[PDB]
Amino acid sequence: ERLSTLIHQRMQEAKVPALSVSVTIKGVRQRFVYGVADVASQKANTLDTVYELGSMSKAFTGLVVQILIQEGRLRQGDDIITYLPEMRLNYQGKPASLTVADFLYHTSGLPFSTLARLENPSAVAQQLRNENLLFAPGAKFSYASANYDVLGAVIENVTGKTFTEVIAERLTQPLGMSATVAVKGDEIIVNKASGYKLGFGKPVLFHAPLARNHVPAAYIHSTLPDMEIWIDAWLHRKALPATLREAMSNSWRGNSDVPLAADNRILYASGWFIDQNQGPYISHGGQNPNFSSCIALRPDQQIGIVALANMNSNLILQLCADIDNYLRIGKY
Amino acid sequence: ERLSTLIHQRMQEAKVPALSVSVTIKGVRQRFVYGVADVASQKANTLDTVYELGSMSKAFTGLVVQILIQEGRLRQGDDIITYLPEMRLNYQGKPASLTVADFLYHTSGLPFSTLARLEAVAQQLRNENLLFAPGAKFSYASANYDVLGAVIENVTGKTFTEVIAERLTQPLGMSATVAVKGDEIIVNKASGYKLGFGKPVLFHAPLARNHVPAAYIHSTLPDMEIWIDAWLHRKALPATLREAMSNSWRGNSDVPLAADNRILYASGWFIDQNQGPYISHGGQNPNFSSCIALRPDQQIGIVALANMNSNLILQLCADIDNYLRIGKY
Ligand SMILES: *[B]([O])([O])C1=[C][C]=[C]C([N])=[C]1
Ligand SMILES: *[B]([O])([O])C1=[C][C]=[C]C([N])=[C]1
């Protein structure tokens, strides 16, 4: 009956050691901070606890891409080969032509093997060289985390800077997100939560080293209060420099130019799923071997929901939807 | 690259003996009639071939319910108990209160086993244990619309078959469309097949009268074309049927939605706003499968009917819609 019941109940059901949730509706915001950030050392999860964003990193990457487009430095229809010259990929008999848009919207065709290759700690172009596409570029929407790693390399090539520096200079600094960072690699982050991989029970895993190339697709780190700032930025675009406002509108534009299933006509935007049903409802989950998270926005009602958890859990990916139901009709 | 390629490709993939498809866009309509209604006797699929509509039936039942509502004889909020006094259902410890809307929108909580059981309805479902409290969740159960058949009969005082004919099939001019009373021979009915390992006939089994409203309506390609055109073009339709039709497409928003599904259920239709309104339903009996989809903004109407049960046929309307929408699939 109570939101706090819903969230607490789902946390126990998911067996996550720490859960952090923030929910805002019509300018009223409640926080839910639960559990321990490190089971063995008994360190309680707090507002300062840092969580890997997994695939929720893609919205930061996509927004930067659209900032560059807004400023005229890049175009969606640009051939990928200009920014990643050495990257050759093949469809059937003949090397395939690919655009920046194909990675933005997951219409590239990159094989499923390319995730466990990009997570492995060669530059991305040589890392994906002589790959075989699952389909013709543009033909279908297939989700592949590696697509946004390709976009990281684009951002560096065009910028002439590192991904971390762009993220900070373009997004984190101007927005005031002081605990959010695109990690360079294995170097330690203070206040960070330990990550767990479920089954049979939650044993620690965090330690495995993080591939630099995969950061833009899966390795941005953040906190609940910074994610709150991120949400409020997307909900309240005004008071932001015209460039960012326009890049944000364009970021939420879904690619309609793909086949849609009978039960699913949702589109993918620049690191977001866009759903018109009881919408606009804009969302994305994150799943990493040892972290999981979700975010959902329903601007028409100024609704913004984010959940961050130190364990990989399919329940966490459904959690933002459950909260949204409770807000929409008092039921979940 | 060609619609004809798409449909024919999908028919080979699905291994359906007969497939009939009709597609209309911007008042241009193409028909695709393939295969044999009966494999053994080599009887070719033809415009007159009759196919079971499975769950497609539900839109006929739902529209009739909405016709009764429009006339004032019925209301969504009515207690089911008034029409089916004998049918008493329980949730947890104690008996649970059910409305007409619960069956219309599949928020009743009827257990899964009931389908195989419906294959009077109230004595049939007496003592049933609800999966959840009425209204709490959307859970599709074919039997929900069988309850609505019994409601239509009790309100009308007529049989389900007579109402469907008098209210819908006769006025709309659908000659070959009928709600089957009990097992009895239908002239032109295609034989039904069950896949696997290779599809042999499943024809013999007898049809439960109680289940007709949910999955037992029979029809033809040209009649389904008339049905589609009636939903797409409602002018020249009596005011009551027009209003019933608008109300039939109103989805029930009062249920929890999954992260990847925000689609609503209407009165025997799924209502999708994405690249929509896009209204669809699929039918799947042991030995028949079918689909239908409408995208009115573009006067688009698609129907497929097949004499074998196939998950591919359920996706076939969406493939065609993709082809129409973006020339790809
Ligand atoms: B991403 O690949 O980490 C990802 C994980 C879980 C859900 C979604 N949508 C993306
Ligand atoms: B119905 O239960 O026969 C049915 C079958 C297949 C799909 C849908 N939507 C309903």
Shortest-distance atom of ligand 1 to CA A145? 2
C-alpha dihedral (B220, B223, B228, B234), degrees to nearest 10: -160
Phi, psi of B31 (to 5 degrees): -115, 145
Q: How far is CA B328 from the centre of its chain?
A: 27
Residue of B274, B298, B303, B328 to mutate, testing the A interface (most A Cβ within 10 Å of its Cβ): B274
What's the gap in Å between A62 CA and the centre of ligand 1? 14
For residue B152, give both structure tokens: 């239509």
What's the gap in Å between B27 CA and the centre of ligand 1? 42
Q: Do A257 and B314 touch (CB under 8 A)?
A: no
The SS3 of residue A82 is: helix
Rounded CA-CA distance A318/A131 in Å is 33
Method underlying the structure:
X-ray
CB atoms within 10 A of CB A143: 11
Using DSSP bridges, classify how beta strands A273-275 and A267-268 pair: parallel, antiparallel or unpaired.
antiparallel
Shortest-distance atom of ligand 1 to CA A143? 2
Of A158, A148, A165, the residue nearest A74 (C-alpha): A158
**Three-class SS string for chain B?**
CCHHHHHHHHHHHHCCCEEEEEEEECCEEEEEEEEEEECCCCEECCCCCEEECHHHHHHHHHHHHHHHHHHCCCCCCCEHHHCCCCCCCEECCEECCCEHHHHHCCCCCCCCHHHHHHCCHHHHCCCCECCCCCCCCCCCCCCHHHHHHHHHHHHHCCCHHHHHHHHHHHHHCCCCCEECCCCCCCCCECCCECCCCCCCECCCCCCCHHHHHHHHEEECHHHHHHHHHHHHCCCCCCHHHHHHHHHHCCCCCCCCCECCECCEECCCCEEECCCCCEEEEEEECCCCEEEEEEEHHHCEEEEEEECECCHHHHHHHHHHHHHHHHCCC
Q: How far is CA A29 from CA A225, A305, A317, in A?
A: 11, 9, 21
- Ranges of H-type helices in A71-162: 100-104, 113-118, 124-127, 146-159
What's chain B's length in residues?
329
Cis peptide preceding B277, ω within 30 of 0: yes
Q: How far is CA A43 from the centre of its chain?
A: 26
CATH of domain B1-329: 3.40.710.10
Q: Is the dihedral of CA A67, A70, A72, A75 positive or negative?
A: positive
Q: Do B257 and A294 touch (CB under 8 A)?
A: no
- The answer to whether A98 and A80 are in contact (CB under 8 A) is yes
Which of B254, B278, B329 is opposite residue A265, by nearest beta carbon?
A: B278
Nearest CA owner, ligand 2 atom 3: B55
Q: How far is CA B226 from the centre of its chain?
A: 15
Rounded CA-CA distance B147/B108 in Å is 11
Residues whose CB is less than 8 angstroms from the CB of residue A12 and which lie 6 or more positions away in sequence, other chains included: none
Any atom of ligand 1 within 6 Å of the Cβ of A312: no
Name the strand (E) or helix (H) holding A12: helix A3-14
Rounded CA-CA distance B154/B137 in Å is 27
Shortest-distance atom of ligand 1 to CA A115? 2
Q: Apex CA A55: angle with CA A53 and CA A60, to 5°?
A: 75
Rounded CA-CA distance B101/B80 in Å is 9
The SS3 of residue A293 is: strand
Q: How far is CA B45 from CA A284, B15, B22, B204, in A?
A: 47, 15, 14, 20
- The answer to whether A110 and A134 are in contact (CB under 8 A) is yes
Residues whose CB is less than 8 angstroms from the CB of residue B82 and which lie 6 or more positions away in sequence, other chains included: none
| Breakpoints of chain A, after residues (C–N > 2.5 Å) | 121
Q: CB contacts < 8 Å between A and B, how many?
A: 84
For residue A100, give both structure tokens: 């920046």
Rounded CA-CA distance A89/A125 in Å is 10
Phi, psi of B11 (to 5 degrees): -60, -40
| Residue type present at position B236 | A
Shortest-distance atom of ligand 2 to CA B284? 5
What's the gap in Å between B269 CA and the centre of ligand 2? 10
Strand order in the sheet with B264-265: B43-44, B28-38, B18-25, B300-306, B289-295, B278-284, B270-272, B264-265
Residue of A263, A292, A295 to mutate, testing the B interface (most B Cβ within 10 Å of its Cβ): A263
Rounded CA-CA distance A314/A54 in Å is 13
A1-332 topology per CATH: Beta-lactamase (3.40.710)
Q: What residue ranges do the domains of chain B occupy?
A: 1-329
Any atom of ligand 1 within 6 Å of the Cβ of A55: yes
Cis peptide preceding A141, ω within 30 of 0: no
| Residue type present at position B83 | Y
For residue A25, give both structure tokens: 């509706």
The residue of chain B with its CA nearest to that of A135 is B329
Residues whose CB is less than 8 angstroms from the CB of residue A215 and which lie 6 or more positions away in sequence, other chains included: A57, A149, A152, A163, A164, A182, A183, A184
**Shortest Cα distance from A299 to chain B (angstroms)?**
16
Any atom of ligand 1 within 6 Å of the Cβ of A218: yes
Strand order in the sheet with B178-179: B51-52, B217-219, B178-179
Q: How far is CA A223 from CA A4, A45, A64, A172, A304, in A?
A: 20, 11, 20, 12, 15
CB atoms within 10 A of CB A88: 16
A322 at interface of B, judged by CB pairs closer than 8 A = yes
